Amino acid sequence: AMKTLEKVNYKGFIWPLAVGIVLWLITPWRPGGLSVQAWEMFAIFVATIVGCITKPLPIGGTTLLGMVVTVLVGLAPVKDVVNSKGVVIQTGILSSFGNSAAWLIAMAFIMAHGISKTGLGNRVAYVMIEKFGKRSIGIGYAITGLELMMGALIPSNSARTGGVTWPVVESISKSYDSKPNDPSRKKIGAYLDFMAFHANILSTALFITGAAPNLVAQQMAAQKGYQMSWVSWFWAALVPVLVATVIIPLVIYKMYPPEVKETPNAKNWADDKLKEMGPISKPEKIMATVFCLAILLWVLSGFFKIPQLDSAFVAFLAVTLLLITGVLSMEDALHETGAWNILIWLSILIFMAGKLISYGFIAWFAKFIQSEVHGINWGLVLVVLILLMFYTHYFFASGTAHMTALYLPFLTVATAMGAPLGLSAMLLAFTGVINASTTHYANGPASILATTGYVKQSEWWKMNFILGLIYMVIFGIVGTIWMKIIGIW
Amino acid sequence: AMKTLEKVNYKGFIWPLAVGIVLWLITPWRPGGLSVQAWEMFAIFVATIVGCITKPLPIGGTTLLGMVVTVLVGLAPVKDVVNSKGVVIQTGILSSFGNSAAWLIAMAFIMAHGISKTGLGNRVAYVMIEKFGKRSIGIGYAITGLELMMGALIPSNSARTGGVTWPVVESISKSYDSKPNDPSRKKIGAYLDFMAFHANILSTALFITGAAPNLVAQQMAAQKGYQMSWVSWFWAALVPVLVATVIIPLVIYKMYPPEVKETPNAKNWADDKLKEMGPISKPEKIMATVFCLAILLWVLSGFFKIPQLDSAFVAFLAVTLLLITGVLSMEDALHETGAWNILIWLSILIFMAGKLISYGFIAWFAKFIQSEVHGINWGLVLVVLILLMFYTHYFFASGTAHMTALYLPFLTVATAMGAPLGLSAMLLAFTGVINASTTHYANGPASILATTGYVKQSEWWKMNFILGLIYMVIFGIVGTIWMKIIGIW
Numbered sequence: 002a003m004k005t006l007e008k009v010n011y012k013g014f015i016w017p018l019a020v021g022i023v024l025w026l027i028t029p030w031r032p033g034g035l036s037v038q039a040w041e042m043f044a045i046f047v048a049t050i051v052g053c054i055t056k057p058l059p060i061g062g063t064t065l066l067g068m069v070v071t072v073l074v075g076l077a078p079v080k081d082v083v084n085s086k087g088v089v090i091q092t093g094i095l096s097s098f099g100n101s102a103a104w105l106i107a108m109a110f111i112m113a114h115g116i117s118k119t120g121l122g123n124r125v126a127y128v129m130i131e132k133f134g135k136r137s138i139g140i141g142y143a144i145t146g147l148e149l150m151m152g153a154l155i156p157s158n159s160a161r162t163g164g165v166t167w168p169v170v171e172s173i174s175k176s177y178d179s180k181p182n183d184p185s186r187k188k189i190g191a192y193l194d195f196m197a198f199h200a201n202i203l204s205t206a207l208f209i210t211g212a213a214p215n216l217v218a219q220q221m222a223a224q225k226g227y228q229m230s231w232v233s234w235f236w237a238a239l240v241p242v243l244v245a246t247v248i249i250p251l252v253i254y255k256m257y258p259p260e261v262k263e264t265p266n267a268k269n270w271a272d273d274k275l276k277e278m279g280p281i282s283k284p285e286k287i288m289a290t291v292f293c294l295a296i297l298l299w300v301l302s303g304f305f306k307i308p309q310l311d312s313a314f315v316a317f318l319a320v321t322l323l324l325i326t327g328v329l330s331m332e333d334a335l336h337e338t339g340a341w342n343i344l345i346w347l348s349i350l351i352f353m354a355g356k357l358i359s360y361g362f363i364a365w366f367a368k369f370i371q372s373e374v375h376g377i378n379w380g381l382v383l384v385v386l387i388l389l390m391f392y393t394h395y396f397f398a399s400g401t402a403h404m405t406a407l408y409l410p411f412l413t414v415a416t417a418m419g420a421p422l423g424l425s426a427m428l429l430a431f432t433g434v435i436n437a438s439t440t441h442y443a444n445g446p447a448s449i450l451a452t453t454g455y456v457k458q459s460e461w462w463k464m465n466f467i468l469g470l471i472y473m474v475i476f477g478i479v480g481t482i483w484m485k486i487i488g489i490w
Numbered sequence: 491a492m493k494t495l496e497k498v499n500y501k502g503f504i505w506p507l508a509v510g511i512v513l514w515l516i517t518p519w520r521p522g523g524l525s526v527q528a529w530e531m532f533a534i535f536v537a538t539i540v541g542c543i544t545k546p547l548p549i550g551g552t553t554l555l556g557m558v559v560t561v562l563v564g565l566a567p568v569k570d571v572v573n574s575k576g577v578v579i580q581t582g583i584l585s586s587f588g589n590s591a592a593w594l595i596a597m598a599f600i601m602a603h604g605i606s607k608t609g610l611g612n613r614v615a616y617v618m619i620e621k622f623g624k625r626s627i628g629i630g631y632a633i634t635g636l637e638l639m640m641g642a643l644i645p646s647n648s649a650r651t652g653g654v655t656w657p658v659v660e661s662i663s664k665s666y667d668s669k670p671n672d673p674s675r676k677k678i679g680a681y682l683d684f685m686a687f688h689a690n691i692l693s694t695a696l697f698i699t700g701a702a703p704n705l706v707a708q709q710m711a712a713q714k715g716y717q718m719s720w721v722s723w724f725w726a727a728l729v730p731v732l733v734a735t736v737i738i739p740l741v742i743y744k745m746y747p748p749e750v751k752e753t754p755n756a757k758n759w760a761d762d763k764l765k766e767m768g769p770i771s772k773p774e775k776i777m778a779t780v781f782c783l784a785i786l787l788w789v790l791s792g793f794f795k796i797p798q799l800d801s802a803f804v805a806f807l808a809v810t811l812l813l814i815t816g817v818l819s820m821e822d823a824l825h826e827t828g829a830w831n832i833l834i835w836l837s838i839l840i841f842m843a844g845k846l847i848s849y850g851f852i853a854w855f856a857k858f859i860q861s862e863v864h865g866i867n868w869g870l871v872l873v874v875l876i877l878l879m880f881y882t883h884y885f886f887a888s889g890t891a892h893m894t895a896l897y898l899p900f901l902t903v904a905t906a907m908g909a910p911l912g913l914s915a916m917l918l919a920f921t922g923v924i925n926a927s928t929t930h931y932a933n934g935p936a937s938i939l940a941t942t943g944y945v946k947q948s949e950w951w952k953m954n955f956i957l958g959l960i961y962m963v964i965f966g967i968v969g970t971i972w973m974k975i976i977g978i979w
């Protein structure tokens with residue numbers, strides 16, 4: 002018996018629509034050397050992002066709407082178009098949900114549901130509160146150190162986030178009664194969410210085995226005659242990453258403070274709650290075993306490249322084990338909405354960014370940069386290249402496509418303007434790492450920790466912009482001094 | 491606070507496991523001319539189906555488990571493997587959820603949720619009960635006639651089912667208080683579910699624009715020198731389809747009777763309920779408009795082949811309209827479990843069948859048939875070919891791959907054993923149509939109407955086997971007499 006329609010934010014359609022429309026009417030006056038379909042896809046993508054901002058039809062709905070409009074105005078098919086030789090010359094909106102990152106994140110949400118159902122997350126939370134609970138910044142630094150230690154083993158940031166630290170964040174927040182999409186999110190949950198994201202950034206920056214784009218940078222620098230190694234990257238990123246570990250958390254605590262700042266009796270409270278939770282149970286032990294097994298497969302995935310260890314099949318396998326074991330039914334995994342919502346909208350955004358890359362937008366931007374800056378001292382050239390490689394990730398959603406597309410061209414321009422090779426390589430790599438401090442779709446950890454409701458998106462974008470300025474200053478200046486020190490030039 | 495694990499049917503793992511194991515140990519003694527990977531994939535597929543039967547880890551769980559085992563023993567990657575020329579020589583478990591049929595069915599489940607929420611389904615149900623409510627077989631024949639009329643326009647059976655008649659079935663069942671997965675399913679819901687499936691079969695058989703496999707048969711017969719036309723197919727399938735319309739419902743009513751057989755006062759009851767529902771509302775009017783628009787796009791999709799009318803993008807578009815209009819939020823579409831469950835398990839089954847087709851199983855079966863039957867009167871040859879083209883669809887899940895793979899070879903053998911061309915073509919086409927009376931994954935309508943809980947799977951398979959024998963008798967004998975009558979030979 003439904004009487005009245007649901008409440009929809011129609012005002013939020015103004016800025017997206019308008020933006021799109023204007024760019025569309027601008028199409029004939031496009032920057033030149035560019036294709037009509039490219040500019041149209043750019044306009045639709047920008048309007049979709051402005052919608053994700055103004056939040057009409059929450060991100061799933063507006064992403065579906067942007068995909069629909071993409072298919073209507075003739076920028077994308079529904080089924081992949083083949084060249085009669087098997088090659089897929091055009092992808093479709095259906096060939097977008099077969100993405101590894103989105104399915105990994107969904108299965109990780111499901112594993113997190115299992116951790117929350119068993120009672121393991123809350124036990125871990127009270128343990129961490131007994132250890133470093135008081136002075137919540139202590140909790141933030143502990144999660145930062147945990148992520149840093151895990152960076153050396155787990156080569157997938159999306160896993161390090163949705164499998165280990167996002168559950169810990171959720172549990173610690175639910176022990177403080179910090180629920181999402183509620184004015185009670187500001188207690189401790191939002192601070193911890195943000196700090197988890199930025200600790201994931203730091204860990205990705207410290208170890209070359211912290212993410213894929215770093216490996217892509219390695220392959221490229223080897224293409225141009227510079228061999229990045231686990232020890233060199235580490236010895237170069239140690240100092241700047243320590244400076245960041247010391248600063249970034251402090252400015253987050255000063256800018257986005259944890260409303261609940263002090264817990265003078267965390268020890269007794271955690272002990273009381275644990276003892277009230279009774280001894281550890283069988284489903285909790287099984288979930289712990291499955292979690293340790295998944296972590297083991299993830300850390301082995303760095304030495305053995307094998308389909309059985311794709312870092313997503315591992316999540317499928319853990320979920321399957323939870324199903325055949327009992328701690329997780331199938332209905333428990335079916336109405337875990339976050340999984341399907343993120344599947345939908347992340348897949349759609351990645352598809353639209355891929356269409357931006359294929360239609361010849363990024364390549365034109367790269368040629369423009371290559372033909373614009375001609376005579377300058379290589380210092381300003383490197384500054385400009387870092388700034389561009391930073392603020393171009395607003396038009397990407399993978400982090401690997403960004404590098405494959407813009408790392409070799411910008412590095413080439415730098416080395417051609419007199420800059421040294423190792424410095425430019427490592428700087429553009431650190432920049433491709435800290436790019437994540439731009440958006441809510443920049444990577445897996447952001448697409449996870451921005452949509453949990455603990456942190457709004459306006460605040461997310463603003464604070465990430467500021468912290469990106471800070472990251473660029475830190476890495477550029479400090480790491481340049483550091484690389485001049487240790488024989489990199 | 492979870493204490494005890496969930497209840498899992500461990501006994502149901504015996505038959506699948508055993509089966510698999512045995513076939514695996516049989517591998518060295520495989521039929522010959524076959525590949526090891528092919529026989530292993532066959533074993534895993536068969537065990538997965540036996541699991542879907544015995545129901546450990548409901549179909550979603552056992553399909554996930556079969557996919558996991560597929561990836562573990564080295565039969566499928568997780569990411570598509572390319573040949574360095576762009577061609578995809580091996581598909582992955584992730585490149586399986588980008589399927590048009592599964593996403594169409596999911597979006598149709600969502601549209602059905604909208605129809606049930608608005609109050610439109612119940613109004614339609616009481617209308618149909620006022621018209622042909624008494625003598626529930628009247629309801630079955632009305633739904634049959636509706637599906638038959640829609641066959642001439644909507645060229646997608648999955649849509650005709652999940653968009654029009656599955657909602658009507660659900661509403662009429664919920665007006666009789668027939669809920670699924672309940673001993674109250676036998677009242678009227680199961681009979682109507684079965685009858686809807688078989689009416690979809692009949693409509694697919696009557697009009698060549700009733701499904702894709704019929705178009706595939708058309709293309710093939712044109713390849714071999716026989717031009718199927720909308721008027722010829724219809725004039726040949728009229729008589730047998732009338733015989734089926736008269737018989738099949740009767741044997742279903744005699745074999746699977748609708749426990750509630752008589753409703754002597756349907757008129758007054760429907761009028762009372764309608765008047766108690768008040769005049770038609772605004773959300774109902776909007777859902778009706780969206781439904782009519784989707785039906786219009788679906789019927790236009792037969793004359794204009796355009797990505798904007800893919801018969802799945804239309805469901806995406808209807809859902810998007812319901813979102814931007816208000817009658818359907820995003821949370822309403824996120825916890826619609828059936829959509830995601832069918833996505834999962836149908837995609838996985840289609841992927842495994844595609845692996846059966848690529849590894850060289852179906853092609854070997856076809857060569858075996860081509861090299862086995864050599865000297866026979868073409869009548870027994872056609873009998874054997876119809877039987878094989880019928881009972882090979884247990885190893886397929888699309889209905890189009892089946893035809894593309896086995897229609898031209900069997901038709902070739904028939905025409906080479908003396909049989910006439912038009913007769914063999916039309917008979918194998920009708921057989922590719924009635925193949926759907928085999929399984930729960932044979933097509934979209936079956937994968938929909940078998941998993942709704944109104945009809946079990948054991949009963950489904952048994953009754954579909956019997957009705958397939960009956961369909962083969964009817965079509966073969968009657969249609970052969972009919973084609974001999976009208977100048978087809």
Ligand SMILES: CCCCCCCCCC
Nearest residue numbers: 017021022048049052067
């Ligand atoms: C004609 C294209 C106008 C721009 C499309 C706006 C898309 C809205 C997505 C929320």
Ligand SMILES: CCCCCCCCCC
Nearest residue numbers: 016020047051054055459
């Ligand atoms: C050109 C981008 C304009 C985006 C404006 C977003 C305003 C959001 C107000 C809450």
Ligand SMILES: CCCCCCCCCC
Nearest residue numbers: 298307309310562563564
């Ligand atoms: C748990 C996945 C381990 C699978 C082992 C695969 C070994 C392949 C050797 C060829």
Ligand SMILES: CCCCCCCCCC
Nearest residue numbers: 383384473474477478481
């Ligand atoms: C010496 C080249 C590196 C300088 C990078 C400075 C970036 C400034 C960010 C605001």
Ligand SMILES: CCCCCCCCCC
Nearest residue numbers: 506510511537538541552
């Ligand atoms: C060694 C492979 C045996 C096949 C097992 C298949 C398991 C599927 C269970 C649903």
Ligand SMILES: CCCCCCCCCC
Nearest residue numbers: 505509536540543544948
């Ligand atoms: C290939 C043999 C399949 C056996 C299936 C038996 C099902 C038993 C259900 C009670």
Ligand SMILES: CCCCCCCCCC
Nearest residue numbers: 073074075787796798799
């Ligand atoms: C509802 C969308 C109908 C299709 C728009 C017109 C496309 C014409 C492309 C030539």
Ligand SMILES: CCCCCCCCCC
Nearest residue numbers: 869873962963966967970
């Ligand atoms: C003349 C032969 C026509 C084919 C008859 C098919 C009968 C199938 C019997 C099950």
Ligand SMILES: CCCCCCCC
Nearest residue numbers: 031032033043366369
């Ligand atoms: C001529 C400069 C225009 C650049 C617009 C494209 C980058 C957003």
Ligand SMILES: CCCCCCCC
Nearest residue numbers: 011014018066070814
């Ligand atoms: C006012 C609702 C508009 C919906 C977006 C349409 C995009 C062309």
Ligand SMILES: CCCCCCCC
Nearest residue numbers: 392395462463466467
């Ligand atoms: C380049 C986009 C900027 C993000 C918002 C900045 C608000 C100060």
Ligand SMILES: CCCCCCCC
Nearest residue numbers: 325500503507555559
């Ligand atoms: C307790 C026996 C279940 C084993 C399941 C393994 C399926 C490959």
Ligand SMILES: CCCCCCCC
Nearest residue numbers: 520521522532855858
């Ligand atoms: C060699 C005899 C036939 C075996 C058939 C195996 C099942 C397709």
Ligand SMILES: CCCCCCCC
Nearest residue numbers: 881882884951952955
């Ligand atoms: C060749 C497969 C036949 C299976 C028939 C199943 C009847 C319940």
Ligand SMILES: CCCCCC
Nearest residue numbers: 046047050051395396
């Ligand atoms: C030009 C619009 C800025 C937002 C980028 C996604």
Ligand SMILES: CCCCCC
Nearest residue numbers: 125165168169289292
């Ligand atoms: C959140 C993962 C905790 C596992 C403890 C063994």
